[PDB]
Design an enzyme around this catalytic site. Structure first.
Site, short mmCIF file in Angstrom:
data_model
loop_
_atom_site.label_atom_id
_atom_site.label_comp_id
_atom_site.label_asym_id
_atom_site.label_seq_id
_atom_site.Cartn_x
_atom_site.Cartn_y
_atom_site.Cartn_z
N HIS A 63 -3.70 -1.38 -4.36
CA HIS A 63 -4.87 -0.79 -3.68
C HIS A 63 -4.60 -0.30 -2.25
O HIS A 63 -5.40 0.47 -1.69
CB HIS A 63 -6.02 -1.81 -3.64
N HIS A 93 -2.66 -3.56 7.07
CA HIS A 93 -2.67 -2.55 6.02
C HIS A 93 -3.51 -1.37 6.49
O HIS A 93 -4.09 -1.41 7.59
CB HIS A 93 -3.27 -3.10 4.70
N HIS A 95 -6.19 2.17 5.36
CA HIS A 95 -6.98 2.96 4.42
C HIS A 95 -6.83 4.39 4.82
O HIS A 95 -6.81 4.69 6.00
CB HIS A 95 -8.47 2.55 4.44
N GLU A 105 -12.70 3.95 7.33
CA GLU A 105 -13.76 3.15 6.76
C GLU A 105 -14.93 3.10 7.72
O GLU A 105 -16.04 3.57 7.43
CB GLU A 105 -13.25 1.79 6.39
N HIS A 118 -5.97 -1.88 9.68
CA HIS A 118 -6.63 -3.18 9.74
C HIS A 118 -5.56 -4.27 9.97
O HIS A 118 -4.69 -4.49 9.11
CB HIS A 118 -7.38 -3.45 8.44
N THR A 197 -13.76 -5.33 3.41
CA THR A 197 -14.16 -3.99 2.89
C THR A 197 -13.66 -3.76 1.46
O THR A 197 -13.86 -2.67 0.92
CB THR A 197 -13.73 -2.80 3.75
N1 LIG Z 1 -9.95 -4.22 4.43
S1 LIG Z 1 -10.16 -5.66 5.10
O1 LIG Z 1 -11.55 -5.98 5.18
O2 LIG Z 1 -9.39 -5.67 6.31
C1 LIG Z 1 -9.44 -6.87 4.04
C2 LIG Z 1 -9.79 -6.88 2.70
C3 LIG Z 1 -9.30 -7.84 1.85
C4 LIG Z 1 -8.47 -8.83 2.34
C5 LIG Z 1 -7.94 -9.86 1.41
O3 LIG Z 1 -8.62 -10.40 0.53
N2 LIG Z 1 -6.66 -10.10 1.58
C6 LIG Z 1 -5.95 -11.08 0.81
C7 LIG Z 1 -4.73 -11.51 1.58
O4 LIG Z 1 -4.24 -10.78 2.46
N3 LIG Z 1 -4.30 -12.73 1.30
C8 LIG Z 1 -3.48 -13.52 2.20
C9 LIG Z 1 -2.84 -14.63 1.44
C10 LIG Z 1 -2.00 -15.45 2.35
C11 LIG Z 1 -2.24 -16.68 2.88
N4 LIG Z 1 -1.16 -16.96 3.68
C12 LIG Z 1 -0.32 -15.92 3.60
N5 LIG Z 1 -0.79 -14.97 2.81
C13 LIG Z 1 -8.12 -8.81 3.69
C14 LIG Z 1 -8.61 -7.85 4.54
CU LIG Z 2 -8.29 -3.82 -8.59
CU LIG Z 3 -5.33 -5.73 -7.32
ZN LIG Z 4 -8.76 -2.97 5.19
#
Ligand SMILES: NS(=O)(=O)c1ccc(C(=O)NCC(=O)NCCc2c[nH]cn2)cc1
Ligand SMILES: [Cu+2]
Ligand SMILES: [Cu+2]
Ligand SMILES: [Zn+2]
Ligand SMILES: [Cu+2]
Ligand SMILES: [Cu+2]
Length: 259
Positions: A63, A93, A95, A105, A118, A197
Site C-alpha cells: 500500500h 512512509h 502518500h 492527504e 508521514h 489514515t
Molecule cells: N498514514 S498514517 O496515518 O501515518 C499510518 C497508517 C497506518 C499505520 C500502521 O498501522 N502501521 C503499522 C506499523 O507501522 N507497524 C509497526 C510495527 C512495529 C512495532 N515495532 C516495530 N514495528 C501507521 C501510520
Molecule cells: Cu490491503
Molecule cells: Cu496490506
Molecule cells: Zn501515512
C-alpha cells in the site's frame, strides 16, 4: 484475497464496510482552513531528536513503502510541540497521487500537494507501538508536504532504492538514513486530534502537520508511481495513487504554532 487498497472495489469509500471507525468522530486526514486555526500559548516548538536514529530496511507493504527505524530504545524521538511525554520514531512512509496536482492527504485551504511524508511515532508510556496505537494519546505523526518544483537530493537517496522493492513483500537493507534530512528549514505546524489514515483507522494520532513543504521534482514523482501494489507473480497493479481524501472535521479544533 480480500485486503484493502485504493482501487475500484477496495478503496477509501469502501473501508467503512470493513472498519466502521472509518466514519468515526476523529478521522484523518482533514482540510486545514487557515482562517479557522486557533493560537494556543500552551503549544511548544517541536523537538525532533533524530541524531542517533538507526534506519534498518525499506519495505514495500503493498500500500506504500516504509523506511523502518529501530524503536527498541530511545534512539530517535519526538517531544514537545503539542505532546506530553516521549514518542519514539518507528517508521516513515509517503502518500502520493497519479498526477502532480494531487496526492497529499492533508490539504491547506483545499490546496493539494504532490505527496505527503508521514513520520510515525509512538508514546513510550505504552511499551510498544501496537498498545500505543489503541490509545487517544498513543501516536504522533508528523506530516510533511512535498511540493513539486525542484528535485530533492535527500529524497533521491530513498527513490534510488525503489527498484529493489518494486513489488509487495520485497524489502531491502537501508542503513544510515537520517530522517531529519526530509524536514523543512522551519518547523511551524498545525495540530489536531485524529486517526491513522489507513486501516485500521484507529483514533490514536496527535497529528502534527508542518506548514512549510519540502521540494520534489516532477521526474522524482514518476518514480513513486513505478511501485506495485501486488506481489510478484500476480497481475501488475501500479501504485499510481494511495491517498485518503479529507474527512469531516466534526467540530475538532486545529491549532497553529507559533500561530
Ligand atoms: N498514514 S498514517 O496515518 O501515518 C499510518 C497508517 C497506518 C499505520 C500502521 O498501522 N502501521 C503499522 C506499523 O507501522 N507497524 C509497526 C510495527 C512495529 C512495532 N515495532 C516495530 N514495528 C501507521 C501510520
Ligand atoms: Cu490491503
Ligand atoms: Cu496490506
Ligand atoms: Zn501515512
Ligand atoms: Cu473489503
Ligand atoms: Cu515493536
Amino acid at each position: 484475497s480480500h485486503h484493502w487498497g485504493y482501487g475500484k472495489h477496495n478503496g477509501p469509500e469502501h473501508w467503512h464496510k470493513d472498519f466502521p471507525i472509518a466514519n468515526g468522530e476523529r478521522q484523518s486526514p482533514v482540510d486545514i482552513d487557515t482562517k479557522a486555526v486557533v493560537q494556543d500559548p500552551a503549544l511548544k516548538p517541536l523537538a525532533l531528536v533524530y541524531g542517533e536514529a538507526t534506519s534498518r530496511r525499506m519495505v514495500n507493504n503493498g500500500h506504500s513503502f516504509n523506511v523502518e527505524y529501530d524503536d527498541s530504545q530511545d534512539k530517535a524521538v519526538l517531544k514537545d510541540g503539542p505532546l506530553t511525554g516521549t514518542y519514539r520514531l518507528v517508521q516513515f512512509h509517503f502518500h502520493w497521487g497519479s498526477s502532480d496536482d494531487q496526492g497529499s492527504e492533508h490539504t491547506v485551504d483545499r490546496k493539494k500537494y504532490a505527496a505527503e511524508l508521514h513520520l510515525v511515532h509512538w508514546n513510550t508510556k505504552y511499551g510498544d507501538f501496537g498498545t500505543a496505537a489503541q490509545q487517544p494519546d498513543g501516536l504522533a505523526v508528523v506530516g510533511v508536504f512535498l511540493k513539486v518544483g525542484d528535485a530533492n537530493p535527500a529524497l533521491q537517496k530513498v527513490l534510488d532504492a525503489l527498484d529493489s522493492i518494486k513489488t509487495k513483500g520485497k524489502s531491502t537493507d537501508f542503513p544510515n538514513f537520517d530522517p531529519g534530512s526530509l524536514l523543512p528549514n522551519v518547523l511551524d505546524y498545525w495540530t489536531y486530534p485524529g486517526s491513522l489514515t489507513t486501516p485500521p483507522l484507529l483514533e490514536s494520532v496527535t497529528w502534527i502537520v508542518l506548514k512549510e513543504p519540502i521540494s520534489v521534482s516532477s521526474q522524482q514523482m514518476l518514480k513513486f508511481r513505478t511501485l506495485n501494489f501486488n506481489a510478484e507473480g500476480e497481475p501488475e497493479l501500479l501504485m499510481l495513487a494511495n491517498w485518503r481524501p479529507a474527512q469531516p472535521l466534526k467540530n475538532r479544533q486545529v491549532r497553529g504554532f507559533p500561530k
